[PDB]
Design an enzyme around this catalytic site. Structure first.
Site, mmCIF file in Angstrom:
data_model
loop_
_atom_site.group_PDB
_atom_site.id
_atom_site.type_symbol
_atom_site.label_atom_id
_atom_site.label_comp_id
_atom_site.label_asym_id
_atom_site.label_seq_id
_atom_site.Cartn_x
_atom_site.Cartn_y
_atom_site.Cartn_z
ATOM 1 N N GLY A 143 -13.361 10.235 -9.189
ATOM 2 C CA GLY A 143 -12.681 9.109 -9.413
ATOM 3 C C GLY A 143 -12.374 8.214 -8.130
ATOM 4 N N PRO A 144 -11.886 6.973 -8.552
ATOM 5 C CG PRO A 144 -10.679 5.078 -9.437
ATOM 6 C CD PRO A 144 -11.596 6.279 -9.736
ATOM 7 C CB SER A 145 -9.244 5.299 -3.131
ATOM 8 O OG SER A 145 -8.224 5.697 -2.289
ATOM 9 N N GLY A 146 -6.896 7.146 -5.135
ATOM 10 C CA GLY A 146 -5.602 7.254 -5.663
ATOM 11 C C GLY A 146 -5.648 7.677 -7.088
ATOM 12 C CB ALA A 147 -8.030 8.674 -9.559
ATOM 13 N N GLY A 148 -5.823 10.593 -8.267
ATOM 14 C CA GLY A 148 -5.162 11.778 -8.367
ATOM 15 C C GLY A 148 -6.018 12.916 -8.096
ATOM 16 C CE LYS A 149 -11.021 11.499 -5.659
ATOM 17 N NZ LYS A 149 -10.535 10.131 -5.274
ATOM 18 C CB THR A 150 -6.679 15.531 -3.297
ATOM 19 O OG1 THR A 150 -7.766 14.790 -2.814
ATOM 20 C CG2 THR A 150 -6.272 16.798 -2.466
ATOM 21 C CB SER A 162 -18.767 11.567 -6.955
ATOM 22 O OG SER A 162 -17.564 11.780 -7.649
HETATM 23 N N1 LIG Z 1 -0.245 12.770 -12.995
HETATM 24 C C1 LIG Z 1 0.054 12.239 -11.640
HETATM 25 N N2 LIG Z 1 1.268 11.657 -12.224
HETATM 26 C C2 LIG Z 1 1.987 10.830 -11.330
HETATM 27 N N3 LIG Z 1 1.555 10.691 -10.114
HETATM 28 C C3 LIG Z 1 0.606 11.364 -9.420
HETATM 29 C C4 LIG Z 1 -0.197 12.055 -10.361
HETATM 30 N N4 LIG Z 1 -1.277 12.737 -9.592
HETATM 31 C C5 LIG Z 1 -1.122 12.268 -8.359
HETATM 32 N N5 LIG Z 1 -0.173 11.519 -8.177
HETATM 33 C C6 LIG Z 1 0.173 10.660 -7.111
HETATM 34 O O1 LIG Z 1 -0.689 10.269 -6.778
HETATM 35 C C7 LIG Z 1 -1.049 9.987 -5.089
HETATM 36 C C8 LIG Z 1 -2.644 10.045 -4.987
HETATM 37 O O2 LIG Z 1 -2.992 11.287 -5.490
HETATM 38 P P1 LIG Z 1 -4.255 12.077 -4.682
HETATM 39 O O3 LIG Z 1 -4.545 13.376 -4.994
HETATM 40 O O4 LIG Z 1 -4.268 12.055 -3.200
HETATM 41 O O5 LIG Z 1 -5.535 11.001 -5.188
HETATM 42 P P2 LIG Z 1 -7.181 11.072 -4.699
HETATM 43 O O6 LIG Z 1 -7.852 10.642 -5.806
HETATM 44 O O7 LIG Z 1 -7.464 12.364 -4.206
HETATM 45 N N6 LIG Z 1 -7.191 9.874 -3.584
HETATM 46 P P3 LIG Z 1 -8.519 9.881 -2.282
HETATM 47 O O8 LIG Z 1 -8.583 11.050 -1.721
HETATM 48 O O9 LIG Z 1 -8.061 8.703 -1.216
HETATM 49 O O10 LIG Z 1 -9.782 9.293 -3.082
HETATM 50 C C9 LIG Z 1 -0.476 11.059 -4.645
HETATM 51 O O11 LIG Z 1 0.941 10.658 -4.271
HETATM 52 C C10 LIG Z 1 -0.022 11.972 -5.889
HETATM 53 O O12 LIG Z 1 0.903 12.775 -5.554
HETATM 54 N N1 LIG Z 2 -14.657 1.922 1.939
HETATM 55 C C1 LIG Z 2 -13.826 3.193 2.085
HETATM 56 N N2 LIG Z 2 -13.621 3.266 3.401
HETATM 57 C C2 LIG Z 2 -12.600 4.056 3.855
HETATM 58 N N3 LIG Z 2 -12.329 5.343 2.954
HETATM 59 C C3 LIG Z 2 -12.737 5.154 1.781
HETATM 60 C C4 LIG Z 2 -13.458 4.188 1.299
HETATM 61 N N4 LIG Z 2 -13.973 4.279 0.172
HETATM 62 C C5 LIG Z 2 -13.102 5.587 -0.451
HETATM 63 N N5 LIG Z 2 -12.574 5.957 0.644
HETATM 64 C C6 LIG Z 2 -11.635 7.224 1.012
HETATM 65 O O1 LIG Z 2 -12.154 8.203 1.830
HETATM 66 C C7 LIG Z 2 -11.527 9.652 1.634
HETATM 67 C C8 LIG Z 2 -12.825 10.592 1.399
HETATM 68 O O2 LIG Z 2 -13.735 10.113 0.234
HETATM 69 P P1 LIG Z 2 -15.063 10.955 -0.454
HETATM 70 O O3 LIG Z 2 -14.606 11.623 -1.549
HETATM 71 O O4 LIG Z 2 -15.798 11.527 0.530
HETATM 72 O O5 LIG Z 2 -15.911 9.484 -1.025
HETATM 73 S S1 LIG Z 2 -17.474 9.662 -1.296
HETATM 74 O O6 LIG Z 2 -17.925 8.289 -1.992
HETATM 75 O O7 LIG Z 2 -18.378 9.866 0.174
HETATM 76 O O8 LIG Z 2 -17.990 10.734 -2.381
HETATM 77 C C9 LIG Z 2 -11.079 9.382 0.189
HETATM 78 O O9 LIG Z 2 -9.708 9.207 0.713
HETATM 79 C C10 LIG Z 2 -11.642 7.906 -0.117
HETATM 80 O O10 LIG Z 2 -10.904 7.180 -1.223
HETATM 81 MG MG LIG Z 3 -8.080 12.796 -2.272
#
Ligand SMILES: Nc1ncnc2c1ncn2[C@@H]1O[C@H](COP(=O)(O)OP(=O)(O)NP(=O)(O)O)[C@@H](O)[C@H]1O
Ligand SMILES: Nc1ncnc2c1ncn2[C@@H]1O[C@H](COP(=O)(O)OS(=O)(=O)O)[C@@H](O)[C@H]1O
Ligand SMILES: [Mg+2]
Ligand SMILES: Nc1ncnc2c1ncn2[C@@H]1O[C@H](COP(=O)(O)OP(=O)(O)NP(=O)(O)O)[C@@H](O)[C@H]1O
Ligand SMILES: Nc1ncnc2c1ncn2[C@@H]1O[C@H](COP(=O)(O)OS(=O)(=O)O)[C@@H](O)[C@H]1O
Ligand SMILES: [Mg+2]
EC number: 2.7.1.25
Lengths: 173, 173
Positions: B10-17, B84
């Site tokens: 998923g994209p950044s902030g989607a909630g993956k971690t 990814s």
């Molecule tokens: N089901 C959910 N409902 C409401 N808020 C959520 C939910 N999941 C995550 N959040 C919040 O959304 C924020 C981002 O979640 P996060 O798991 O860090 O996303 P991510 O995809 O891993 N971002 P990144 O690592 O930068 O690609 C965090 O503050 C979570 O607590």
């Molecule tokens: N252009 C970007 N520059 C900096 N960070 C990014 C960028 N795109 C995504 N990120 C963030 O960097 C962190 C690690 O990302 P990854 O999961 O390792 O991305 S990936 O494309 O190489 O699979 C995540 O918080 C991601 O959202």
């Molecule tokens: Mg994450």
């Protein structure tokens, strides 16, 4: 529940992959589950364009260390066969991996040049590759690894038995 | 003997971690052994100076795939949480990993921008970083992943339940 890592370090042509493969056959014949991490094999799977400058080798070593750490800590015997030419990198690996078993195949330069089925030393002598570890590339020899074997004086079978002997002495087997 | 991999894309902030960590917590309480591979965590451990061009991300993804494949074929549940962003790479992962469970946290850009505790969208919108996946960096959405969850409409609890439900229907749990 934590298993161990057999880390085989040495210059090119020392016999690392050979010993790694013989150990794999032996441990799996005993019913153990084993993973092989070979430097050349990991490079061509994961990053075949990666070169051999110091920063590049270091990143690749860090990948192999983390792979072994994760497998080992989950009960899986891991055998590593990578050049790992600097002492500081093998100390890093020993710190990351609890049950760390360092194995050094020691072999003189004149024998290593005569044990080169891939032709690396030949290419190096012709300037076609530079800094081959073992010729003009530096190799920092381990001072007191868990196992030293002289591959010019021991058979592969005796190298295997010597590693297994040390593994039982450690209580890992 | 063969375990499975939960691949959360998923994209950044989607909630993956967040979902990866909740799944880890749930499965280990059930008495399972689990390894977590988070994109940000693996990067800062293995190569903190790796950038975000396509070839750089692709290397990092291949590393994660190989770690997941080695762990899971030895019976170890692996949870991957990495952006990814391209179908081709997730298809590669699916080919490399027998029991592959793709999980897609789907969330609109407007919500994602308000869920940015690391401030990546802020840094992007002021040109401080370029090509943030989810803003101007591309993301190819999975078409039919094993599990889709709408993190703007579902609690983390309900996301975990949905993943566990799919795992039992596959026969993996
Ligand atoms: N089901 C959910 N409902 C409401 N808020 C959520 C939910 N999941 C995550 N959040 C919040 O959304 C924020 C981002 O979640 P996060 O798991 O860090 O996303 P991510 O995809 O891993 N971002 P990144 O690592 O930068 O690609 C965090 O503050 C979570 O607590
Ligand atoms: N252009 C970007 N520059 C900096 N960070 C990014 C960028 N795109 C995504 N990120 C963030 O960097 C962190 C690690 O990302 P990854 O999961 O390792 O991305 S990936 O494309 O190489 O699979 C995540 O918080 C991601 O959202
Ligand atoms: Mg994450
Ligand atoms: N104890 C041994 N006695 C005699 N010959 C050996 C012995 N071990 C290996 N050889 C041979 O030596 C050659 C090189 O061995 P190999 O296992 O490929 O070394 P290596 O250290 O992995 N080289 P490299 O991968 O380039 O760093 C091969 O032909 C082996 O068969
Ligand atoms: N300068 C060099 N150039 C090309 N190949 C080398 C060089 N030095 C060593 N090699 C060989 O490249 C193969 C992979 O080596 P590695 O084990 O992966 O080395 S390491 O330093 O990064 O740990 C090995 O067969 C190695 O002997
Ligand atoms: Mg070799």
């Amino acid at each position: 529940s934590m298993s161990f890592v057999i880390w085989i370090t040495g210059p090119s042509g020392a016999g690392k992959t050979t010993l790694a493969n013989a150990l794999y056959k032996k441990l799996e014949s005993m019913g153990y589950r084993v993973e092989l991490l070979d430097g050349d094999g990991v490079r061509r799977k994961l990053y075949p364009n990666l070169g051999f400058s110091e920063e590049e080798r270091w990143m690749h070593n860090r990948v192999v260390v983390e792979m072994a750490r994760r497998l080992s800590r989950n009960g899986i015997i891991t055998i590593v066969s990578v050049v790992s030419p600097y002492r500081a990198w093998r100390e890093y690996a020993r710190k990351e991996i609890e049950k760390f078993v360092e194995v050094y195949p020691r072999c003189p330069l004149e024998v290593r040049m005569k044990r080169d089925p891939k032709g690396l030393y030949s290419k190096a002598l012709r300037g076609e590759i530079k800094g081959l570890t073992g010729l003009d590339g530096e190799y920092e020899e381990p001072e007191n690894p868990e196992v030293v074997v002289d591959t010019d004086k021991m058979t592969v079978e005796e190298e295997v038995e010597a590693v297994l002997k040390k593994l039982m002495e450690l209580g890992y087997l």
